[model samples]
Target: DVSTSELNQFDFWVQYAAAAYYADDYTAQVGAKISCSKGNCPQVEEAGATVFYDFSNATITDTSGFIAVDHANEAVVLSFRGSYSVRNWVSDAIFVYTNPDLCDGCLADLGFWGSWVLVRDDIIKELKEAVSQNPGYELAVVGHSLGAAVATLAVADLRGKGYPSAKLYAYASPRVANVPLAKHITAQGNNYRFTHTDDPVPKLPLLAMGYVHISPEYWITSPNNVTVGASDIKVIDGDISFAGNTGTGLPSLEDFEAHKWYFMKTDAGK
Candidate 1:
């Protein structure tokens, strides 16, 4: 159900559409913006700890407001909604065509698998400028679902540019390529792959001659529906919370039924 009042929600703007690219670009322009630091940047120290926090209620008024981007040379974290099918197919095709032997599937998978390319050039441009300003900063990328796929592609592009291997992370991304391809790409360095539960998409067309889920798994679900290797994935079962809708000072089943929670209720969303 589309509500006129809710039509202006950020989620609506984030739906998979070509216009979304320009919209996001435009939004970035309007928001409080910051240029990358200039001149020789400082060197980054090695750190091997994972930090997790709950930011459900945080309001991100500026993209740079996130501390991760400033220290992106040391550590960078990215979060995006799971909507990318419509906006990123072209780049995915190019990637597959460039590495034909990596997977033996239809060319369309390459065409529509990820959206990183749509934003890749811009992201790389910003990252290069940022790095020029601050030398020796390691970088990391992370995302959930569709965003995870984007992050994977972004990491690949960065690696192609001779960046260090120890600065990339992916969470719950579908198999980007066959087993050999995944292994070759991940062997670069400090890369971590995380998955969860019975997410059907990841298991699609099981990698017989290709990739067969050897990546580390994190089980965020119960045993009844959990797979073996994925049983130890990071779990954040109750971290999400939501509020119900009210109508004219009254609460009703219609309002409740119309309420949809993505990360809070969906199995693979978070």
Candidate 2:
């Protein structure tokens, strides 16, 4: 149903999202290793990315992500890591909506917004520099799970701050916004959200409580650890379409394994 090239593009950002999990170390590494914090990460080195700035605030907000230069791909990447620390529990517990003010009526998850705000200025400062150095390189923002939720907000803010062409790739992201905010993100375009088969993370905060997803969810139908193909990926267009992940009607049992892997193993930190 899709092209191999497009699937590979998805694969590229997913690996970057996974790489963020391993990018906790503030110091950059010279080459690819099991524990890498620099742009030399095995997960993204092949993709032509070189880490320029790696930031983390695990103790306070459990927020971590990186800004890298994709030499081969000619793109600037801003990636965020998912929940892996005890402090993350604190961020996850607060699920109330707060005003991001991206749009007149836009509201976002309080916790997710809080996490991004901690690193937003720092990441944006580095990202702006990366864009300046690269000139015409593409801008990409990616994340998984909690990182995905945070990345979603980052892209929205980035769009209004200068990089309107900044693209987002969110994996296993929870419902982060209300209808107005979701629609605000949708209107920006170049936002791609992927959910695994029955990965219950995306169904969280409860649609009943007013949270909604961004548009055009790419639901992966393949089982865990299986190689994803073009046909295995179904593109469902809508801010909250029932035919997509929303069809599950609120997940009763959350699957951790399903949340960890997207096309490939995403928890590189583990």
Candidate 3:
């Protein structure tokens, strides 16, 4: 029923989005954002050992980030990267034109599904198995851009599987999930999205085609102005937001700069 949280209560923006950025490697996103120090890297979340997280397919390949002892926290961080390659861009154009309605759940975008389905099956199976094996670790699923769309699916699927406490913080994400699916997930109070000024990627898939984002969106004002006590952020519900309606006020072009800005200047990387 709530539509807003303190603008200052956005601490996860600093931590979770950072995990997604590290997964992104277009502009040398490596090492620091993630851990490849041991040559490869651990990928899965486990009790006795850490495993290297690797994802690749006929479309998107070389995706990074992991689910393991966060080194800094008691829980695990499952992260995903945005579109990085021409092949991925190909998947981006696939649009809502595949499979049975909803593809696995309620109507969803086929392009976004392409970006994740090829690689996520194993990750989901392993993560869920790990969760059952070693309980008590808080789960956080995060992503940016194309990856954010996948993260939304991940959180929704996992919650249905009984992990309702699993939290999601998608940044600069596209609207891929159907309204019913999105609202059902949002109603749980753990699905939150962040959008800065005019990131064009969020207003996509054409709501004319029935695609939508979940509710309680976090908006960051422009010109590097996410103030401390007065961050100037406003929350909008799923139906009224640009991400959902796609016709919500002044539209911005597809700004890649604003896309990156949402994470860089915030708590994600700091």
Candidate 4:
């Protein structure tokens, strides 16, 4: 059994601290850049290894030194390269935000969905073991982009298993599903979604046709009033590329005209 005493040891604390720091820094760096708006936006700079949020232009860039802290003996796990499969209309509609007939599973086949599912399973297993051994220990899930989607699903899965409802945080995750579905999946409020103004991916299935409007608690808006959805912490930066200006001009994801540009350039064409 894993003991709290063991976790509190100096060596364990050191490693935990290191991982927490790196996770935060890595997330901040990636999230800040990924969340920024395009063109006419402010230019964000990497101050040393960290990205500073320039609220002046509402832009953020570097986040190499941000870290996550578990203040209540909660175990924080960072899942990378996570994806999930959305082969059917049910699953596809959840992540991409369009009706099955509109997007026709095009986005799911692109590989982001599947990748998140894989990561979700791996993280869930890890959390299960930790909980099984530690009994009363808490778990916090976190990830950026694809990993963020997996984090959401992982929380849903864990919650199904009777886990408490306050241990998950997803940063800059694209809309995981239609607003109602997202509401059902994240009904417990244990999950937090953060997105930026110019990051086109997160705004998929744009707000009309019942897509979630991001509860005021979970919304991150830009200087221009673009809602980013609820972000436990909002990091805005410039200097990040939007790849293609696809979804930027679309009013909602239900409209087939929305640009489904790939943030992960390599993953876009699939």
Please, what is the whole-model Cα lDDT of each candidate in the order they appear? 0.35, 0.78, 0.56, 0.36
Model 3 pairs whose backbones collide: 14-267, 14-268, 41-52, 42-51, 42-52, 42-53, 43-51, 43-52, 43-53
| Per-candidate RMSD, Å | 15.1, 3.2, 6.4, 14.9
Query: Against the hidden reference, what TM-scores do the models get?
Result: 0.49, 0.90, 0.71, 0.44
> Would you list the clashing residue pairs of candidate 2?
39-51
Each model's total of backbone clashes:
10, 1, 9, 37
Model 3, span 3-38: residue lDDT tens: 235442354343444443442322331222343322
- Report clash pairs, candidate 1: 41-134, 41-135, 73-137, 73-138, 93-110, 179-211, 218-232, 218-233, 219-232, 219-233
Top-scoring candidate (lDDT) = 2
User: Could you tell me which 10 consecutive residues in candidate 4 have the lowest summed lDDT?
Assistant: 49-58
Which stretches in model 2 have alpha-carbon errors above 4 Å?
A: 23-43, 85-94
Question: Candidate 4: what lDDT?
Answer: 0.36
**Candidate 4 residue lDDT tens string, 60-109:** 31111122223234443333323222122222444333232212231222
Model 3 stretches with alpha carbons more than 4 Å out: 1-16, 21-52, 56-64, 85-94, 97-105, 132-134, 224-230, 241-254, 263-270
